[PDB]
């Protein structure tokens, strides 16, 4: 089994991780870490390094990979949460797709039913399409990575479960993303504009004119599609029930400070990602947006799809301190 080989390789490459069997999931080798909120996510394989490459100090306590483009089953999520539970609650970060919501939600009830204090954060940052093929609402994409790092820092320093969940939900309302593909994981000199990470169709198919013109269209879309009101359920562990919470996003606007993530969906050369970043800085400055930090590289992929995405997350001084806090994972490492 290739997936089995790939996971064994990740485990052999990183002594800081433990690969479990029956069922399969990955955790920090030092989990459970007593006294800290434990953070978990998971999803289909085919988006590496999301999420296994984000397991470590300052970030995920563990992750549950599923088959290609498919959510892990609830037993994987449950056993992973039980393995990392440090007695202070487990926070599950779930990307907004039909399968992920159903499995993580089922795992959440089984955990609660077993005495574990748990709650959830749903990520729906992709501004391109509402109600795509596998999603009720907006798709969860690359901002998931920024949220895991920020909430990961909050949990690592000792914040409460409620404080980490509140932070995750707030960041979710403040992060906006859009991706384009020039080829699948076609048309010829055409791109799928607003493509999804499982290959879902975008807003439309259009002609690729230039890299700069493409960034302009992506950026303009992030500005005009920012406003959004919808319901996201979360687990209320006190009542033992799902809570339907109306959530609101404001569009990005002049005066906002952001963290920018220019993300390779798979086969985009790093040189091109820098050209993308260059044009993005110009557009942000014209629009009155201040980029305070950036991440440029392959952080949330779609197999070998040829394309990239842009994510802009509004932040403040407190959030920027959580960004700068230490993180030690396979994909992200700083002691800043």
Q: Which residues are annotated as a binding site?
A: 44-47, 95, 100
Q: Active-site residue among 14, 51, 176, 198?
A: 198
Contact criterion met (CB below 8 Å) for 110 and 57: no
Which CB, 228 or 323, lies closer to a copy of itself?
323
Q: Is 198 a catalytic residue?
A: yes
Which residue ranges are tagged as binding site for dihydroxyacetone? 44-47, 95, 100
Q: Please, what sign has the CA dihedral across residues 316, 317, 322, 326?
A: positive
Q: 243: exposed, middle or buried (C-beta count within 10 Å: 0-12, 13-18, 19+)?
A: middle
H or E element in which residue 190 lies: strand 190-193
Q: Strand 204-207 relative to strand 241-249: parallel, antiparallel, unpaired? A: unpaired
Q: Give yes or no for residue 278 binding a copy of itself (CB under 8 A).
A: yes
Which string of x and - marks every residue 167-206 that binds a copy of itself (by CB under 8 A)? ------------------x---------------------
Contact criterion met (CB below 8 Å) for 36 and 88: yes
Q: Assign residue 303 a region: left if phi > 0, alpha if psi is -120 to 50, beta otherwise?
A: left
Which CB, 82 or 320, lies closer to a copy of itself?
320
Burial of 161-174, coded b for 16+ CB within 10 Å and e otherwise, reads beebbbbbbbbbbb
Which CB, 198 or 249, lies closer to a copy of itself?
198
H or E element in which residue 246 lies: strand 241-249
Q: Give yes or no for residue 223 binding a copy of itself (CB under 8 A).
A: no
Q: Which stretch binds a copy of itself (CB under 8 A): 134-142, 166-174, 187-195, 292-300?
A: 292-300
Give the integer Cα–Cα distance in Å for 152 and 156.
6
Please, what is the minimum distance in Å from the beta carbon of residue 293 to a copy of itself? Answer: 10
Q: Which of residues 303-332 bind a copy of itself (CB under 8 A)?
A: 303-304, 306
Q: Which of 2, 115, 188, 229 binds a copy of itself (CB under 8 A)?
A: 2
Q: Is 47 a catalytic residue?
A: yes
Please, what is the minimum distance in Å from the beta carbon of residue 117 to a copy of itself? Answer: 33
Please, what is the minimum distance in Å from the beta carbon of residue 197 to a copy of itself? Answer: 13
Which CB, 252 or 265, lies closer to a copy of itself?
265
Q: Which of residues 12-71 bind a copy of itself (CB under 8 A)?
A: 12-13, 45-46, 48-49, 53
> Which of 250, 249, 279, 287 is CA-nearest to residue 262?
279
Structure tokens at 71: 């959510």
Please, what is the minimum distance in Å from the beta carbon of residue 157 to a copy of itself? Answer: 19
Q: Give yes or no for residue 277 binding a copy of itself (CB under 8 A).
A: yes
Q: Which of 166, 190, 212, 324 binds a copy of itself (CB under 8 A)?
A: 212
Give the integer Cα–Cα distance in Å for 37 and 137.
28
Q: Strand 118-123 relative to strand 190-193: parallel, antiparallel, unpaired? A: unpaired
Q: Which stretch binds a copy of itself (CB under 8 A): 109-117, 223-231, 251-259, 290-298?
A: 290-298
Which CB, 189 or 246, lies closer to a copy of itself?
189
Contact criterion met (CB below 8 Å) for 139 and 96: yes
Q: Which stretch binds a copy of itself (CB under 8 A): 116-124, 135-143, 167-175, 273-281?
A: 273-281
Helix ranges (DSSP H) in the chain: 2-13, 74-84, 98-113, 143-157, 161-172, 211-224, 270-287, 317-324
Catalytic residues: 47, 198
Binding-site ranges for a copy of itself (CB under 8 A): 2, 5-10, 12-13, 45-46, 48-49, 53, 185, 211-212, 266-279, 281, 294, 296, 298, 301, 303-304, 306, 333-335
């Amino acid at each position: 089994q290739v997936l089995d080989e790939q996971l064994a390789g990740l485990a052999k490459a990183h002594p800081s991780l433990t690969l479990h069997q029956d069922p399969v999931y990955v955790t920090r080798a030092d989990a459970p870490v007593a006294g800290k909120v434990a953070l978990l996510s998971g999803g289909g394989s085919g988006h590496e390094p999301m999420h296994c490459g984000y397991i470590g100090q300052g970030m995920l306590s563990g992750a549950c990979p599923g088959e290609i483009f498919t959510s892990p089953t609830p037993d994987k999520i449950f056993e992973c949460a039980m393995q990392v539970d440090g007695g202070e609650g487990v926070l599950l970060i779930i990307k907004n797709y039909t399968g992920d919501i159903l499995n993580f939600e089922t795992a959440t009830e089984l955990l609660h039913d077993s005495g574990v204090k748990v709650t959830t954060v749903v990520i729906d940052d992709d501004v391109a399409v509402k109600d795509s093929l596998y999603t009720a609402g907006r798709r969860g994409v690359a901002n998931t990575v920024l949220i895991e790092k920020l909430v990961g820092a909050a949990a690592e320093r000792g914040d409460s479960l409620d404080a980490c969940a509140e932070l995750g939900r707030k960041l979710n309302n403040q992060g906006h993303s859009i991706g384009i593909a020039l080829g699948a994981c076609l048309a010829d000199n055409e791109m799928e504009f607003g493509v999804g990470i499982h290959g879902e169709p975008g807003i439309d198919r259009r002609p690729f004119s230039s890299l700069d013109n493409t960034v302009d269209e992506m950026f303009d879309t992030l500005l005009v599609n920012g406003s959004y009101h919808r319901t996201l359920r979360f687990w209320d562990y006190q009542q033992g029930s799902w809570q339907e919470e109306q959530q609101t996003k404001q569009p990005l606007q002049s005066g906002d400070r952001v963290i920018a993530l220019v993300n390779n969906l798979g086969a985009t050369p790093l040189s091109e990602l820098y050209g993308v970043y260059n044009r993005l800085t110009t557009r942000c400055q014209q629009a009155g947006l201040t980029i305070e930090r950036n991440l440029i590289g392959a952080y949330c992929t779609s197999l070998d799809m040829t394309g990239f995405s842009i994510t802009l997350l509004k932040v403040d001084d407190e959030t920027l301190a959580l960004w700068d806090a230490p993180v030690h994972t396979p994909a992200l490492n700083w002691g800043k």
